[PDB]
C-alpha cells in the first residue's frame, strides 16, 4: 500500500466542499 495519508484532506466530504 502507498496512498497518501492526509487526514487534513477529508475524503468523506471533499466533493461537497468543492461543489
Amino acid at each position, epitope marked *: *500500500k*502507498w*496512498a*497518501s495519508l492526509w*487526514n487534513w484532506f*477529508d475524503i*468523506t466530504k471533499w466533493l*461537497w466542499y468543492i461543489k
Partner: antibody
Amino acid sequence: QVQLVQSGSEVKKPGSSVKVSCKASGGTFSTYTFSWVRQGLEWLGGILPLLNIANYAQKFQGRVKFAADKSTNMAYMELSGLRSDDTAVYYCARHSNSWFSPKWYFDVWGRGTLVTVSS
Amino acid sequence: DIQMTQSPSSLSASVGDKVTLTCRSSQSISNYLNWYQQTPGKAPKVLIYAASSLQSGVPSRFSGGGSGTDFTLSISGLQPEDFATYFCQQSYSSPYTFGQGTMLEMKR
C-alpha cells in the same frame, strides 16, 4: 447493483501484517470513497482511489496503509504490528457520495474478511 | 473523540409492538447521524441516514428523528425480521464512531 467482493480469511501471527482486499463489482471506483470497518464496530480508515488519498483513525497511527488499483477496481488495506486484539471481521464499505450531501453513510458493505491473530 | 451511547442495551418486545431506540452523542453533531441494522453472520445495512431520511427500500414503519445530541429510531409495528441489532453512527467528525448497539429479542 454496485457490490463489494472481499478477499478470503487470514490467520496471522502477532507482530506480522495482513493485507485485506476489496473489489468493486457491478461498477467502478469512480469518485467514491471506501473504508474498512472491523467488528462493536470500529472504523480504521479509508481511501479515495480517484486521488490516491487516504484518511485514518489516530488509534491505528503507524499501523495502517491503503492502496487502490484503478485498472482492477481493487482497494487494499495493510494492517501491521498485529496484536491478538486485532482479531475481527474486517468489512470494506463504500461511503455515499458527498456530491449530494456531506451527511454521508455507509451505503455498500462487503461480506467481511475474518482475520485471526494468534500464535 | 465523539462517544456514541445507545439505550437500552437489549430490548424484549413482541411482533406488532411499537418501540423507540435512543442514541446520544457526547458532542453536538447536528443531524450527521445514521442507523444500521445487523443480523448474525451478515454485514450491517443502513436504514436511516441524516437522522431522519429513510434509505430506499426500507419499510416505512422505520422512522428517525433528532438533531444535536439526542436521537431516536422508532419501529411502528415490529415485524419478525426487525429482531436484530441496531447501531447508530456519527458522520460529523473523524474518527467516525458507532454506538455499542441495541439488540431486540422476542418476548415469550
